[PDB]
Amino acid sequence: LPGEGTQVHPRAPLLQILKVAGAQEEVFTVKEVMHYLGQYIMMKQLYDKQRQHIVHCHDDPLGELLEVGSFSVKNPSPLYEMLKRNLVIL
Amino acid sequence: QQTFXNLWRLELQN
Fold first, then answer.
1. Where are the transmembrane segments (chain A)?
2. How many residue contacts between A and B have a Cβ separation below 8 Å?
3. Distance between terminal CA atoms of chain B?
4. CATH number of the domain that A76 lies in?
5. What 3-state DSSP class applies to A71?
């Protein structure tokens, strides 16, 4: 994935998720994409209530992009693999 | 007992 200031454009299914989380722009940095993904998971309460590094994304649009039913924030590879598939590097 | 907001922020900023 690109570095700090590099700009990216999310593909449509990812952009829709970011829009749910309040994003009004079409171009982001990777860190800004991660900000809105965290916002989305937080607002929808997809994290496990007891063990909050675990995210349950099955049956949610986010799981369709991640291709997994759950993931750990401390094992973020599925997130970054999804971003590689869903970001156009500008 | 850390919150999702702090755990995600630690990753985002790393």
1. none
2. 32
3. 20
4. 1.10.245.10
5. strand
